[PDB]
Amino acid sequence: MGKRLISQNRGRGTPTYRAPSHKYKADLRHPRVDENSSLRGEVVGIEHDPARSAPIAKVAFENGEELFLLASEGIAVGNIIECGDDAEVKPGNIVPIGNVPEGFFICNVESKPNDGGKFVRSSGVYATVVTHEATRTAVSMPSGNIKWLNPKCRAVVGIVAGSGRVDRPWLKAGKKYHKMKTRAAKYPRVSAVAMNPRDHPFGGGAWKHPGKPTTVSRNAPPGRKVGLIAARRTGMKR
Amino acid sequence: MSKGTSSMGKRQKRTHAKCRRCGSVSFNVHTKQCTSCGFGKTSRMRTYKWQAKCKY
RNA sequence: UCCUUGGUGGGGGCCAAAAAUGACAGAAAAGUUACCCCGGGGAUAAUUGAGUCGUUGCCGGCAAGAGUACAUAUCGACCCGGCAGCUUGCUACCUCGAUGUCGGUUCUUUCCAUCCUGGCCGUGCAGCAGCGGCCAAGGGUGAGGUUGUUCGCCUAUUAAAGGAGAUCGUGAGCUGGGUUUAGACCGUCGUGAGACAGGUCGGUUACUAUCUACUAGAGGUGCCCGAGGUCUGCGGGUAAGCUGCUUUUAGUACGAGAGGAACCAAGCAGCGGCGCCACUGGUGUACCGGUUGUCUGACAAGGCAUCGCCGGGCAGCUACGC
RNA sequence: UGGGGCCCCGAAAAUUGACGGGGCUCAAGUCGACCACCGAUACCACGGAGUACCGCAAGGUAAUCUCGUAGGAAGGCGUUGUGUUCGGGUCGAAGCAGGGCUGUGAAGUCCUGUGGACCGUUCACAAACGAAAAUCCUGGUAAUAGUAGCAGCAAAGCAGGGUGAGACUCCCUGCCGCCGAAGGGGCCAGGUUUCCUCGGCAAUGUUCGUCAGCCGAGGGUUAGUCGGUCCUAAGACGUACCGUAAUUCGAGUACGCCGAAAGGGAAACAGGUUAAUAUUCCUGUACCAUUUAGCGUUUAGUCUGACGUCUCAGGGCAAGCCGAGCGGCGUCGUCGCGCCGUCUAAGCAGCGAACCCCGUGGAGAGCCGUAAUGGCGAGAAGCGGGCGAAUCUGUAAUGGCACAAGUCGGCUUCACCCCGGGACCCGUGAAAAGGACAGCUAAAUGUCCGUACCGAGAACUGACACAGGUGCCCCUAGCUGAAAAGGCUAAGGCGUGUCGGAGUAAUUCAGUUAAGGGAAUUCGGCAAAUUAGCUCCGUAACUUCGGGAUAAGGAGUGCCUGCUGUGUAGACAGCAGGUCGCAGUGACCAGGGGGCUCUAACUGUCUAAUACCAACAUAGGAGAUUGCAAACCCGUAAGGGCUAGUACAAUCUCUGAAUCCUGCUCAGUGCAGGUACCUGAAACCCCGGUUCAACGGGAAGAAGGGCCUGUAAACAGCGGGGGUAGACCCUCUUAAGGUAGCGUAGUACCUUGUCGCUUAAUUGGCGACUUGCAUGAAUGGAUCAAUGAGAGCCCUACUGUCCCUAACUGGAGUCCGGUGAAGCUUACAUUCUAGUGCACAGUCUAGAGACCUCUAGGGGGAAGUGAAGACCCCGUGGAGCUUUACUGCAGCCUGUCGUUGGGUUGUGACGACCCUAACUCUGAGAAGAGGACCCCGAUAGGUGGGCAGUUUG
RNA sequence: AGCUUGUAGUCCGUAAGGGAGACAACCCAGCCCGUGGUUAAGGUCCCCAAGUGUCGACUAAGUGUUAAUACUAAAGGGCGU
RNA sequence: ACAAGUGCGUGGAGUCACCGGGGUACGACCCGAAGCCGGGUGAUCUAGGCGUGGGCAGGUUGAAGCGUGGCGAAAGCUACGUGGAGGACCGUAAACGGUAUUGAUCUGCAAAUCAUUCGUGUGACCUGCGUCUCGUAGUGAAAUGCUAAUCUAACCCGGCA
RNA sequence: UUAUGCUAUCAGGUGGAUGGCUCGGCUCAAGAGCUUAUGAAGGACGUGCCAAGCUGCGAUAAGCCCGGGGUAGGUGCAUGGAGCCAAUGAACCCGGGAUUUCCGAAUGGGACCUCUCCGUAGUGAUCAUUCAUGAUCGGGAACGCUCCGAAUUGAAA
Ligand SMILES: [Mg+2]
Ligand SMILES: [Mg+2]
Ligand SMILES: [Mg+2]
Ligand SMILES: [Mg+2]
Ligand SMILES: [Mg+2]
Ligand SMILES: [Mg+2]
Ligand SMILES: [Mg+2]
Ligand SMILES: [Mg+2]
Ligand SMILES: [Mg+2]
Ligand SMILES: [Mg+2]
Ligand SMILES: [Mg+2]
Ligand SMILES: [Mg+2]
Ligand SMILES: [Mg+2]
Ligand SMILES: [Mg+2]
Ligand SMILES: [Mg+2]
Ligand SMILES: [Mg+2]
Ligand SMILES: [Mg+2]
Ligand SMILES: [Mg+2]
Ligand SMILES: [Mg+2]
Ligand SMILES: [Mg+2]
Ligand SMILES: [Mg+2]
Ligand SMILES: [Mg+2]
Ligand SMILES: [Mg+2]
Ligand SMILES: [Mg+2]
Ligand SMILES: [Mg+2]
Ligand SMILES: [Mg+2]
Ligand SMILES: [Mg+2]
Ligand SMILES: [Zn+2]
């Protein structure tokens, strides 16, 4: 049994591949609101979230539930946050996308109603509300897909704070090492051609090469699906 | 530095303590189980058929 | 013929024919390992050794002829017959419970098929200088650039700067440059693992000497009036020297000229040998002096820091000296 | 002239040597004959043994029997015990050492000596039944050998006096020394009595020993205040649920509980005392907590606990240093210096620097500040007030000091404490217990555990009194000096990095110096040598503009006399004159430098124990999957990692900074998509068959394949032949014929390619050419400043690397006293030559030498010792790895059945549509979103080195 | 080729004793023990028991003093004899 | 199976024991490997992740920022002071690593240590303690390295004679 | 008077074979066959006048009490000094009781801590029930039943 890949070790859940969950400030999600209910709240401070390398806003609501929130760009201290359908379409507000005008930017979008926010959460990403229909609504996601979402799926208006984070080159292996200390990722990573044949499909040989096509099928078993997984195409744009 | 006598002076700590149930120094201090009698893992005493030979 | 009996469908069987195993007295069957492991083999290879000698080195016979003429001063076709075992082969006799595998270095020895030194002969030898051959193994046969090299080339000297053997002398002497481990790169092969009698970088040299041999130093007995002294010489060993340069012979012999020797004699030098310390040089931790930092209260006298460091040096030893 | 015999030349080999050696000449050689003798276990004879067959037996025959490996057959000897017969033994059994006799022999019996209780035999029968050997196993013991070691990293001892039977070795004194930023001091883990007193030396101690971490005996650890305890962290464990064939097995959830002797934390200090305990016991002076009682209240939600890295200001203080006085010691040849001390805790009371806040204030042709950043009408300076530190002062004031002084000033102060500022982060740097805000007084209570000692060149760990490691983990005084470097000294610990004498070779480990030459040595400047601190002048190519750079190349440096400048001050910087030496960073300390290439960008990582590399990683570049109930992965399942995440993300790959770039090929293999047609299993449906089915067909057709398309920064590939003066028509074109570049390369066989520089000379280095056996673009190409214990070459400087070795120093060795192993070994052995022999002999054969024993020497030989060869082969032996080997198994894809319901159309049960009601997901739930789909059980087909077993004669 | 592969006989393997200097398999010889005798192979100058044996010649080279043989040099030449 | 030829068999000798030889399967005369599989053990060593602590003598260089001053009409250019950045530099017998001597030693102090010479030494740093990840599995800046002197599949017992 | 030595014997040392003995072991047969929350087995620590190990016992600690047997000595393996016990019948054996620290199924919470924390004095978990009370938990040489389940090897692969 040639040795299991790094993905199989990660899936097993060993301490090398586990996230340092105690380092993070708090799970980010929209506040729980009953149907046809609303709550107000004010920002008490902009903190730093190690899980995302972006700011998060500490919001104190009207029922006294101090809840960490994902910070859209421009949110400040002493700003009022509103939730519900009756909430005004304003930056930093949590509203359904069915009330948002088409062409606006939203983030922390919910896959389902009362979801807590799944899509559009990285530092600086945003979504565009494309079309409104009775049962649906189209949102142009940061990837580019025109995802169709429920009209009641909440989202905070504005782009996510911390835009431009990847503009700085890393410039040094220590800087990326210090980022990866607070991450779950393994750093540094050895190339598979440098491995022995027991460790990787691509390892071994008198000279560094895979010896087999790097585009692997989608029907490959675990421990074989490496390289270019199920590629539609390869190479730079000719 | 070597793997022989050089790194064998780091043996200033323990991995097995004297188990309560049997008085043998086999109680692992990390898994909380005696590897001789199985105290801390089971109520019964661990005994296997491979601890002796097949009786034929 | 089919499981109590009879039937129906469907199976099982006897005899014969066909379908194939070509590895053909009949497995349904691809590689790689230098990351390798294990059991054995000198039943079988790299390795040294032995046998053989196609090949290699060295020769001989007959002389076809070239040499103005003239086989045999010199070269020696074709064909034939050898020696050596110093190149590569062939073989598988010894060794796989290991005979440490190339080259160099150190040291000793051996063969002559002699490069120089010694003695001769022939010449198409005037002299000088060659050319070929015979005797001869006492001595000499070096220093350097590339390359891991052997070999070979190249350099300047040199009388000449021969070859070969000793387990391709010599790793319980050394070195580790190459080849022959594990890592990695380049190129070429392979779908791949990986491979290359291709290249490149890196890569562990274990041992307290029992016996024998040699080198030196002693104790005994043997011989013998007891002891001492001085000698002899059965024997053993040697290279105890070997070889050049210059002057004289002599600008003579020879030669038309240029050019140009030998006998005898002398001095010096190269290497080797043996011995020595007046002189010169080295050391000289005896000794003397200067001086840094610090300690013993200051001066003085001392300790330590490689003899603290530096300068000088007697005796002794030693060569770079004699 | 022919045919013959012998001999000669032809005829050269490596340790001295072989007719077997001596030697031999009308022979001791060769040829033709001859005589006599020697000489076997053969032959003859005699006596004997065994065997074969025959004979009833005596016995008869054997020229026609007598060798023998693998092996067959027969008959016997021996050990132990059973049945049975007959026995022996304290008037001495077995066993053991030697010897006589018998027997072919196995063996038996007997005798001598020792011994102190059992032992045989007839006839039969059984077996844990016979050793010379397995690198056999266990034990005992040699030779080596009184040898190596008791040396290298810290070379340490001497005199006097003791004790003692006994002294280099133990004790005292003095002298001389080692460490002195560790070898001293404190303690974690660990040890577990090693601690302390007494008595011994059989073993331990690398010697001895009266000594001892040893041996024997006894004694030693005292806590409200130091820790644990308490708190929670990473993370464990328990119960329940759920899963599992099942559990002691398993993820998650809920509730708990543990998790730190270096995190958080309620409080104690000074002196004394013992042989060993001490913030614990005693003296003095305190403080903290809980509960009970009296006197009244909440402010109750905050603050603190509670936070990273770098840098720095201000304040304090231990330690340190200087001056005056006072008290002892040292020195005292002359001088009047040198050393020690001159002490004072917590607790209690008081002041409070920065920062912050409050009341005033009114600042701009700008003002106030800091080391620095800065601050200001959104209100600066200034003036007041509040909150507020370390320390300091007063008391504690009597403790200890020989009851000897005991009183004062100043400087500095880390690395310790307080406080504040700034900068950085694609790092954001813990939580909880506890504590403060309503407490004051009184009394009582404050259990349990640890406490000795070492904490390491002798108390731990590595088999050890181990040159390692754990620990250099935290502290460490004077001078020099930047310094905690190195050197010299305190304190403190030691002369135990536990063998001594002796001074006489060679050789050896580590050092000092070496004339003249200066890499001629060598694979190669390996090693050694040079230089070296600080200030000043000056500093090239190239470059990514950061660097290179300490480039390179130079000058000065001590001591004394007298001064200057900055600073508040410590101290720092500078100048003039004089003067000594061979030498002024005088010792210690401390870069040699430069040029041209290859390679990798760099810092980093790596085969612990032969590879510190050019390999790995890296930032940078590019590609791929995935919209989250995702992609990818773990699990049998329950359920999970990524994930307290969400495309500026995670996962999977290739390449490897920057600069200039990255061309052609989709034929093969792979991947993705499209699927009109072909093929395509089972279930269902139809026909035949079956008194029912099995079975044979047909219809339809999923995934997958064929097929078509895209994809090379996917795996990969990118060519010959003829001519034309070699720039063209064509080739060879089963896709394409290698573009930019680079090129004898780290790739180049030919090969030491050819030319130039380098050298007297270069299989070398660099540059150029390049017909490239077999270069080439993210299988990345070229190139690169800086960096490199990387790989080559060259120049200068240096030198014992060398010519060519010498002398000297310390430790070994040699000799002596003590202690004291191990490894080779069938036997013998004083060898040398040649031959023979499995073709490499000290033992054979023939010669030659050799009196024996001992010491030192280095290693010729013993195919020296270490060791069932790791190279090659063989084994119907393995393992790992690979794949379009064989056969399978997980995973994944898809049809059918079940889960699984209701209504509608289009068809003859099939496909789609709609619904909620099962089901799924989310939330605590109201409810929201999907929804008869997905998941799941089974079955059918495909893909499938992801994984397994095998084969590859 | 002391090579490799056959065939006939005989050997070693499994073969003593005697002799070739030693010699697995070359000659005598196949061998129960002791004694005596005579021979086999081969030898008789000494080493070593028995011939300084006999007859007729050759060799002048220390040739030779070597049956078989893995242990022993040819072609060619000699007015050597 | 028709035929004729032949195969096998047929005119009564086996069975059961004791003492033996041999074949076959079982450990099968005795010893001898690498291995293959089941269940358990191990992260005191070493590799990696995480929690909480401790450390880095003494110097050097002098990034951004800030002050003042020059040069210009402006745009802008520029000197000094201050500043304290960097996977920066030198450097210790602090710590970590382990280059060369192919030195010492190689029946050692040591089953890899010692001397001199070396690389890093403010960070991808070193390290104490705690905790976690493991056998076809873990870890690995990737050597088939490490996972208790054991690694191309550990160790213990069992299958196993 | 020849050392170092060689061979054979003898005496002695070192040594522990042979012989002899043996309270042990092995094998076979015949009986008997469960125990534990009324707290086991197993372990830690303590326990003796001088007592270190083993054995026995558990703060009543090589022991205590009662009924039966035995009767003159006893004080374990292990006949030492000094004492003690016993004719009020011990020691010893059989039967019935008492005591029976901590852990351990271990069970009030907790274990790197065989001890520790709370004491409101302990029925931990899963269960049956009338909610009075009761069951299961661990051990036992092998055997028995149920379920899961290899490979070496043989076929000369
Ligand atoms: Mg693979
Ligand atoms: Mg069994
Ligand atoms: Mg490899
Ligand atoms: Mg030798
Ligand atoms: Mg036989
Ligand atoms: Mg024996
Ligand atoms: Mg000595
Ligand atoms: Mg000192
Ligand atoms: Mg002693
Ligand atoms: Mg705790
Ligand atoms: Mg590098
Ligand atoms: Mg790389
Ligand atoms: Mg391309
Ligand atoms: Mg050179
Ligand atoms: Mg072998
Ligand atoms: Mg075979
Ligand atoms: Mg396989
Ligand atoms: Mg098998
Ligand atoms: Mg014959
Ligand atoms: Mg025969
Ligand atoms: Mg014979
Ligand atoms: Mg018929
Ligand atoms: Mg500056
Ligand atoms: Mg450094
Ligand atoms: Mg190991
Ligand atoms: Mg086994
Ligand atoms: Mg088989
Ligand atoms: Zn236990």
Side-chain angles (χ1 to χ4, degrees):
Chain A
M1 191 282 310
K3 301 286 278 298
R4 285 186 158 174
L5 320 184
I6 303 281
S7 57
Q8 301 188 291
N9 303 138
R10 175 188 299 103
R12 180 158 160 166
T14 70
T16 298
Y17 305 96
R18 275 187 172 274
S21 303
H22 46 266
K23 286 199 178 190
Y24 308 145
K25 297 293 173 63
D27 180 20
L28 303 182
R29 46 90 168 164
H30 293 159
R32 270 78 195 276
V33 191
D34 284 8
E35 198 175 9
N36 308 142
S37 300
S38 303
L39 73 165
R40 293 170 62 93
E42 82 167 355
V43 184
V44 308
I46 318 297
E47 300 199 24
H48 173 270
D49 185 18
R52 310 162 57 251
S53 298
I56 68 178
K58 195 179 189 62
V59 192
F61 289 100
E62 303 304 334
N63 51 4
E65 288 175 352
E66 46 201 36
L67 189 50
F68 274 111
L69 288 201
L70 192 149
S72 63
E73 166 149 345
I75 195 177
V77 70
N79 296 141
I80 318 296
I81 304 305
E82 311 162 349
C83 170
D85 300 335
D86 47 352
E88 179 215 16
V89 171
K90 190 187 52 175
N93 270 340
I94 312 181
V95 294
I97 51 183
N99 298 338
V100 162
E102 297 164 353
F104 278 178
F105 298 150
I106 60 188
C107 69
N108 198 11
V109 178
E110 300 181 356
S111 165
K112 311 184 320 302
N114 311 119
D115 196 2
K118 306 289 193 180
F119 320 110
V120 192
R121 277 154 56 93
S122 279
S123 65
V125 308
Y126 63 96
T128 294
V129 182
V130 184
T131 58
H132 290 308
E133 306 184 0
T135 80
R136 282 185 311 176
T137 181
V139 289
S140 181
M141 302 192 72
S143 62
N145 300 10
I146 290 283
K147 165 96 171 172
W148 280 103
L149 291 167
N150 182 283
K152 304 308 307 186
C153 283
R154 309 135 78 190
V156 58
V157 185
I159 80 171
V160 182
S163 189
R165 167 171 47 71
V166 295
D167 281 8
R168 189 197 189 274
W170 274 124
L171 190 71
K172 167 167 92 173
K175 196 84 176 298
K176 195 168 166 185
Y177 169 82
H178 289 313
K179 174 176 178 289
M180 299 273 84
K181 296 301 294 179
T182 82
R183 253 50 184 185
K186 175 67 185 152
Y187 189 82
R189 293 293 300 275
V190 166
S191 67
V193 288
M195 305 186 175
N196 285 125
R198 196 179 58 165
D199 299 317
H200 204 263
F202 296 161
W207 57 286
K208 305 288 210 310
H209 74 304
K212 59 191 73 171
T214 53
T215 48
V216 66
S217 178
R218 173 71 90 185
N219 205 64
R224 175 60 184 98
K225 184 170 307 184
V226 308
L228 295 172
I229 303 177
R232 269 67 160 268
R233 59 160 299 142
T234 60
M236 273 188 59
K237 268 305 177 181
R238 264 165 66 183
Chain B
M1 317 197 81
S2 164
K3 48 199 177 189
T5 70
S6 178
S7 83
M8 280 180 173
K10 300 195 185 196
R11 313 174 87 244
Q12 306 292 354
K13 60 196 85 75
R14 69 172 36 75
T15 182
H16 284 77
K18 196 177 173 66
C19 168
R20 269 176 276 160
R21 173 151 81 172
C22 56
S24 186
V25 179
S26 309
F27 195 76
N28 199 327
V29 309
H30 309 281
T31 55
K32 320 298 182 183
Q33 291 172 350
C34 177
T35 61
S36 172
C37 66
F39 174 55
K41 173 174 70 69
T42 178
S43 61
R44 335 191 170 198
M45 303 298 171
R46 66 180 286 277
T47 42
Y48 300 89
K49 273 304 193 164
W50 47 261
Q51 279 176 331
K53 287 201 168 300
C54 296
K55 297 303 185 185
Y56 70 96

